[PDB]
Amino acid sequence: NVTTDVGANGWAPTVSTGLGDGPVSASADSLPGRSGGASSEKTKVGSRFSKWWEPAPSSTANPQPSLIALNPSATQSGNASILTGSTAPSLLAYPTATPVPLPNPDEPSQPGPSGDRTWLLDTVTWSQEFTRGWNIAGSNGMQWTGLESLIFPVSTDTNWTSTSSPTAYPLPFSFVRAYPDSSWAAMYNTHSMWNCGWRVQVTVNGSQFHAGALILYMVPEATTHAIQTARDNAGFVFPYVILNLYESNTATIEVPYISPTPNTSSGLHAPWTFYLQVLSPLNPPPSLPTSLSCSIYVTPVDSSFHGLRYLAPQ
Amino acid sequence: NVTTDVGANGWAPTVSTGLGDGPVSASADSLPGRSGGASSEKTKVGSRFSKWWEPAPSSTANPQPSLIALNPSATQSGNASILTGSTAPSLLAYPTATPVPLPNPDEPSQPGPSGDRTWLLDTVTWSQEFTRGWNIAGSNGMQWTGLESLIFPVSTDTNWTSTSSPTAYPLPFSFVRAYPDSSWAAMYNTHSMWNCGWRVQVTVNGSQFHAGALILYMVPEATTHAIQTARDNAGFVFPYVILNLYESNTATIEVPYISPTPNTSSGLHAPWTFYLQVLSPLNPPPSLPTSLSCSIYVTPVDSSFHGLRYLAPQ
Amino acid sequence: HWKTRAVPGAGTFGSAVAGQELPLCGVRAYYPPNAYIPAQVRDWLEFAHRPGLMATVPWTMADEPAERLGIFPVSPSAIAGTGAPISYVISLFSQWRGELAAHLLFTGSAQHYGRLVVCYTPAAPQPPSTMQEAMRGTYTVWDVNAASTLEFTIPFISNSYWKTVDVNNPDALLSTTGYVSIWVQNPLVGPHTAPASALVQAFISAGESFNVRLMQNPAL
Amino acid sequence: HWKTRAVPGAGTFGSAVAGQELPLCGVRAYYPPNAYIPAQVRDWLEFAHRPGLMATVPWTMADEPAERLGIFPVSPSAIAGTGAPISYVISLFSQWRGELAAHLLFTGSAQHYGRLVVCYTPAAPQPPSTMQEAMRGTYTVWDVNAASTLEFTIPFISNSYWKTVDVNNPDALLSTTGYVSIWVQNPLVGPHTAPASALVQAFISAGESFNVRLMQNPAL
Amino acid sequence: HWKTRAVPGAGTFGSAVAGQELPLCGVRAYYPPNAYIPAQVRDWLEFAHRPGLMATVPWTMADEPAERLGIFPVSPSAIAGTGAPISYVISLFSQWRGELAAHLLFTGSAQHYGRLVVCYTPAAPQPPSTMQEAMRGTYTVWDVNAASTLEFTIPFISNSYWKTVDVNNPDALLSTTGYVSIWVQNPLVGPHTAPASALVQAFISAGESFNVRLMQNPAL
Amino acid sequence: HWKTRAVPGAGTFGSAVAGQELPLCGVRAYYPPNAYIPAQVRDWLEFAHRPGLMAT
Amino acid sequence: TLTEDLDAPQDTGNIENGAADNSPQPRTTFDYTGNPLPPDTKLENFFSFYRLLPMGGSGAPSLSFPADEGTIIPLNPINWLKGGIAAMLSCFTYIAADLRITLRFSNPNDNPATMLVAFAPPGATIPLKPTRQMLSNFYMAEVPVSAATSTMVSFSIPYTSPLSAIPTSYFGWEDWSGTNFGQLSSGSWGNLMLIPSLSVDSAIPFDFQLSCWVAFGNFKAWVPRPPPP
Amino acid sequence: LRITLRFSNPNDNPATMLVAFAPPGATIPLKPTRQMLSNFYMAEVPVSAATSTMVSFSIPYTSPLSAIPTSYFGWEDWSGTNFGQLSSGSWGNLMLIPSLS
């Protein structure tokens, strides 16, 4: 239904000829190897040429009640569990993809239950003074608006200690720094490439008299423009779940693995970044605290590490 | 799988037309005649138009032992035989090709066992003072780096006697000069064209305490750039066998006939040239000679001579 | 040889014309496996279907009945500049049609009660001045204490099949469909020591029948 | 007559474009028989599969354990300038993949004994400083007195499917796969009056899964 | 309209290119009957097959044995300038192959007797100096008193499949096949009062396997 | 490549000539339903068949 | 595959025999697999693309010739190596293909010209004084050259060499007298004779600049040679 | 990728532009010359005098990555000198060289 040539999704004999030429297209590379790339879904050599020398979440039919009513749910990973007694969002942002053949032949090293588990990433305060689009982060977080000059390697203290409050939680950078002795971080500092998904949950307990909303954002490849648009009205294009005090005391969000390569380089690339920003400023009841405490959790989903060699931290 | 026209490997009717033109290609010439050209494989006339007046070598599954162990082999040609008691390389560099119809009708003259035999080409010394890429040659050899001004005919003494040491063994130039009274050289000086393959073997006996390696190179059409690249790291693209003192006391290499023409002109063209250069400088044991003697052998394989006429030497 | 004659416009470049490119790569290229990457998008409407905040409307206990809290015309002067994902898709094209999905999220307290009437009035020379005048069009009286978000459908009660996206002429007959306004039906109430105010987050996204055609340089 | 219109780029020459040549020879040519000529090559990888020396690493009896004898990054700064047949093929193209075959030929004495550990460590910000740190990657402890050559496979443990051949940026994530180094595991030993040193000839060639694409002007 | 793009070389004329002519005669022409005309030639080799004198070699009774009467190299310096019909055909093309037919016509007396040895020696750096040296190649001792003409075949004992017709380089390996010479084997004898001399007319024509290809401007 | 030769009148515009336009709209357009509109005329003679005063 | 092995296969071979063991050596927890062959490495495909031909002499990118007599450019591989594509061809001893050549004639003066390019077969007698009449006997093409700019034109020549395969290197002499060493004039696709033509008369004699591009059809190569340093 | 280039020529004399395609990951020459650019997949485009000349090209997905990122949170090299960039993550580089007779 277009006058232009969108491509035949491959290479055809009639495209390139000595009488006429059309736009050239690339075909799919058929490769053998170990299945990997996609998280939660991953599970004699001879040359083919002769040699010269050789011879529904949101529905009006199912309305979810406010904080008052009993509506319990739970999230489990490894030996960790987080419970709630009221309406709580818990969504995988994107559906898991299909596995792909890996270019490397080495068998992966898996941390298992010791690594893939729900970890207490950070504990932070949420005051009423924070306005719309205010990114909240604590001691384990990092000030990342995209304008900060990151001194390599990211483990340098100046990157995490700033004159103003931190804003982001770069994965796995923030997770590895929070728990450097974990089995996931042990393999992370020993392997050149990794692969896993990420699940972030935040618990904010407020009474039936408290009001306010927080958005749990998972930002892919966080850069200056991307972080600022996530603060704006269009930010909801990115994976999100809102923690509204009217009905919820917690909100969960999970995202599968993403990267230009099937395996991400350790200590040099942050595919996902968590952002806990304010949609509706905290509106606490009179004669009560003007701030509520928040507990941020992080969960690596289906981890695999390739390329074992010496210890090189981030 | 290319946008360009690589050619249909022949002449097609749709290529050249009054409406469109494509790249013209040449077809294979179907010719009758005597089978020749390829060594070791070679074994009423009327016009077709009316007249107006008329009505594995290297494998880990089969590791070859060092010089210490018994691993004998032999090379035979004519009434000549060369034995060894240790691991020795013996490879035909390229597989023999298929015969082609000859343009000439005359029956070939063959020297037989008297010509096709293993001849003692030269005896030369291999000292430890020779470094990487040092071409070794003796009295019967020729200084050929490609820069020497060869005075025609090649039989001129100035071509073989130089101020510096000789380096190459041009075939058949060096073979005919070493044995001018041989049946192969008798036909060589009587025939305008010849055809045969070449086998070169070198024997270097060193004790179990000696170390060093020599490469037996067979260089096609030896010219300035070709000879210098054979001395370098890329030289192994040319036919080669290494005579490593760790395991070997001899190394054999054979190459089939090559030439732009099915038969090579006598005294004017050297298809193959032998080069015995150093890979690892001789590393002799203390209190022992600083040089080892080497014996170079040459073997013409399946010879045939065409075009008999008067005696014209090289 | 073929006898040919050139028609007017020889050598002219066209963005919608096919068959102009010449091969600048001779070999057949093979792209690496990319099936492991999730979230594959193929249509611009997928962005429009995603949520997008358009207005943060405040609501206090002091607000009396028939008090206007917000009003916006369903014209390219507003719907193309809300900041929502849908407004960017609308600005890229010249024409639009179909229903619009409005989601009013009540981010107040669980102890708060009250009603906010959301009114949609079709095209008129003058917008509704009072609450009862706005309630003469398609409206929904929304009780805030139930499920968190209100699903308000803005029907495509239009004169023509398509509406123009021209910011220079938003009040045209072939451009605007009307006005959507929020009014205080029943005052915000709640126990003492509860918040005196409650924010309502207004989201806007594309409906199941929403469409856009005829591309242009972003309206804004 | 045919009504035609010229698209942009008329009269432009293309190296990858077909059907530009006009016949400069009218008769049908017949080439002479060439089946008698051996060693017919049809692919550039055939050159890469041929052996090629990259380093002449010395090894003496005085060399103690954990002593480094050689180290090179598997990046276009090294693998494209070794002097081997494979380095020329790599330099001709922009991308490469697959395993690399390393052959360490022991040209010492039959009376010599010892061990040299060959370590391959994947990509890292800093190369291995000590022997035990290098032995944390894919390695093979090689006893020199057995068969003459060591067959060490350099695995393609890569982040991406293809690696770039850019000499200007060799340490890039999409360029280097790591480092390959030689260390003295067990000191070179042998009887008295035997050579005090033994040279090891390091060869490098293409593996059975090695490939190269996207041609360019020789990197060096 | 057809979207077309011009390749390099527009408006260029080619002698081997077809489809360039435009009709300069509208009606269908009918040629008069020409079947009554004999001697229709269709190939250039037909001219080469016709006889052609190349040398008038004299022979007297005073000529002793081993005396040279004539010699010519089978190269483009001679075979393309004999004056024979075949030499013109050879000069028109760049390459030639096949056997050459030489016809030595004895125009002497019926009372004359003697022998002339015709020798063909393949390619060599130096031509034959004596009769016995020339007789080491393909020769035929011809007794003049039998049939009038001697049928001497010059065999194509060549290094390559084709020989070049380059007058600038006749002694090249890919140009000459050798030398053809005439020597007095047995002295010319006859009764008293018979002619003291006898002329031998040397003719040269193409053999049944003779061919020529790749046209050029006449070599001479 | 196709061997072509241009005939006289190259680049000339013709009102009765077809195949001169180049696409200035890439997408396939869909026109709104117009079957509700009456009085569809398809010929110029339909106007001629309608009455017309010529002289009083 | 096994995670550990007490009796694993050893990894030591012998490269002295003449061939490298390019097979991936088996390792625990490792799964070596092959890869599909790209069309980029095939010599029939690689040499089908055009590359700038080095002009005879020093291997220059361009050659300047007067408009009075013109120039003769040989299509000989050995003559091309005296300077790139020549370096790529030097990796092969013998080659045989159908040549594709594109010429570029840079015209400096303000008036248009016409170039006469005739194909002289390999082995043919090359005229001492190139004239319009003699070059017309060969397979020629008349190319119109524009003013103050360069004009490009492509040609196709099949394998017309008398040899079975054209050598890039030659150890020997061309003639039996032994005057020219390391050359074979016939071992080529022939010679291209150029003659400029002008309708107007210029007071100052100017020179044309020539640039050449070469591609190969049905490329066949024999007896590999080491790459250039 | 499909790309159309326009070369505006200011002077009164015609020219010729040499546009060569450098693959993503290939070494880009410091001094672009006619000989080196001819080794890449090139095209010689005639440029008219005192006006602009347009020419279209087609390049398939030749990037070594599975998908080209428009945003990148990390470093290109292991030394960490270039942040937020991936040179190979592209359709390559187009090298231009003007030519005058």
Side-chain angles (χ1 to χ4, degrees), chain B residues 286-302:
Chain B
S287 74
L288 268 88
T290 59
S291 60
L292 282 174
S293 184
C294 308
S295 291
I296 305 161
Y297 310 91
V298 65
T299 308
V301 187
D302 195 24

Side-chain angles (χ1 to χ4, degrees), chain E residues 24 27 30 40 47 55 58 66-68 74 83 88 103 118 121 154 165 167 171 175 184 186 198 215:
Chain E
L24 201 63
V27 290
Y30 288 97
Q40 189 170 24
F47 282 81
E67 176 62 40
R68 197 186 69 186
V74 193
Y88 179 74
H103 319 279
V118 183
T121 51
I154 304 165
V165 186
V167 74
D171 65 325
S175 189
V184 179
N186 289 68
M215 67 176 191

